[PDB]
Amino acid sequence: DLRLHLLLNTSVTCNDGSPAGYYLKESRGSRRWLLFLEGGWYCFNRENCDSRYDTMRRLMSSRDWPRTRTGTGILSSQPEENPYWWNANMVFIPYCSSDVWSGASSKSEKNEYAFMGALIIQEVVRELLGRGLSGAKVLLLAGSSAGGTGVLLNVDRVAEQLEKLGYPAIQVRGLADSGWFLDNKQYRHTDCVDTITCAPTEAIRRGIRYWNGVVPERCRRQFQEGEEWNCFFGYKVYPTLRSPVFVVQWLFDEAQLTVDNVHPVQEGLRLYIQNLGRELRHTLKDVPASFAPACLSHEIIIRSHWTDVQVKGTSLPRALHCWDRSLHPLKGCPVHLVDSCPWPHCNPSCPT
Numbered sequence: 110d111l112r113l114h115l116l117l118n119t120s121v122t123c124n125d126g127s128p129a130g131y132y133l134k135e136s137r138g139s140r141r142w143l144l145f146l147e148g149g150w151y152c153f154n155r156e157n158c159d160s161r162y163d164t165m166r167r168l169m170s171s172r173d174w175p176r177t178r179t180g181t182g183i184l185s186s187q188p189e190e191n192p193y194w195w196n197a198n199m200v201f202i203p204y205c206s207s208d209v210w211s212g213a214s215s216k217s218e219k220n221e222y223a224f225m226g227a228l229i230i231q232e233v234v235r236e237l238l239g240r241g242l243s244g245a246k247v248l249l250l251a252g253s254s255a256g257g258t259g260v261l262l263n264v265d266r267v268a269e270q271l272e273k274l275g276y277p278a279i280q281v282r283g284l285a286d287s288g289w290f291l292d293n294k295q296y297r298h299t300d301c302v303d304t305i306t307c308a309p310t311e312a313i314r315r316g317i318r319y320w321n322g323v324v325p326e327r328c329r330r331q332f333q334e335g336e337e338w339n340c341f342f343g344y345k346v347y348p349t350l351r352s353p354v355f356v357v358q359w360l361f362d363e364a365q366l367t368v369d370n371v372h373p374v375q376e377g378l379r380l381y382i383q384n385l386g387r388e389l390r391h392t393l394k395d396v397p398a399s400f401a402p403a404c405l406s407h408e409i410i411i412r413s414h415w416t417d418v419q420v421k422g423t424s425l426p427r428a429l430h431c432w433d434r435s436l437h438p439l440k441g442c443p444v445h446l447v448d449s450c451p452w453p454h455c456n457p458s459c460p461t
């Protein structure tokens with residue numbers, strides 16, 4: 110079990126002003142630290158944040174959080190369930206800012222909600238340095254879904270933070286799971302009038318202004334004012350990053366299909382789905398550390414059965430271990446694993 114700690118800096122808050130926090134399970138014989146960012150969509154104006162507060166309140170507030178959480182998947186401490194990093198120090202950071210981990214705005218007389226995701230990550234790192242992170246050799250910032258996008262937005266800032274605090278020897282790395290989205294043509298189209306009709310490009314454009322959102326500096330300098338929404342899309346922000354990042358992405362991700370307005374498949378939709386897999390595979394061609402199976406699913410790394418899926422005969426825990434070795438090609442230890450077959454479940458190891 111991981112144990113809850115609320116942030117001692119009470120100015121760093123969830124959406125409703127309650128303190129943010131993190132769950133921690135220490136491994137005092139280890140110099141490896143895993144910091145995982147939870148996912149779960151976002152909200153981008155007063156009306157849809159209000160609805161989220163009614164029926165998704167654990168993603169907006171710490172008031173009802175439990176004292177412990179059980180580590181699963183890559184956060185498990187049992188080698189049987191986690192062949193990769195079972196002996197690491199484990200941290201789970203709840204997502205209570207609804208801003209894809211980009212916000213830097215407090216609640217105030219002009220802001221009904223606080224959006225502090227980028228500042229929550231910075232403060233968790235600061236407070237952990239007093240609980241053993243000062244002696245780390247590797248800090249892996251990982252995340253699933255909106256938390257995977259959060260890795261891409263924040264990994265270089267954690268690296269910069271640790272250098273300025275005087276810890277240049279800690280190697281900062283990223284692991285982005287199910288957060289590599291395409292701003293592609295939708296299968297059916299709706300103008301942006303309300304939450305369900307707003308495509309991500311338009312929703313994130315509005316969100317950045319509502320959240321006071323921040324993006325990585327080199328990507329910001331490329332796209333400039335009014336176009337920072339581009340940095341929320343992996344294939345555009347990844348080439349600007351200096352930290353090593355491993356990318357996990359299902360080729361037919363269910364969240365991608367939902368934003369594309371896709372729910373007996375005839376020719377038009379068959380061609381649409383095959384083209385989506387082709388484009389995703391193309392965006393990963395020059396990503397040397399990546400795992401991309403031909404499955405219809407969403408998220409993987411905190412699932413207890415994450416060990417079961419394979420690409421070209423190699424599991425995800427093995428590919429991550431091969432990545433570790435490569436950061437000291439390897440015979441029989443690959444790091445770039447992308448399926449080439451063109452339909453969901455053409456890989457027999459896909460989740461049921």
Ligand SMILES: c1ccn(-c2ccc(N3CCOCC3)cc2)c1
Pocket residue numbers: 149150151209254255258290309313341342364365367368
């Ligand atoms: C660019 C940056 C983030 N995204 C993104 C994040 C989450 C989602 N999903 C949340 C749950 O349901 C809708 C789909 C979709 C797109 C796109």
Ligand SMILES: *[C@@H]1O[C@H](CO)[C@@H](O)[C@H](O)[C@H]1NC(C)=O
Pocket residue numbers: 118120121228232
């Ligand atoms: C508390 O967090 C705020 C927001 O990032 C920051 O400006 C302030 O310096 C922090 N205070 C301390 C004592 O770390």
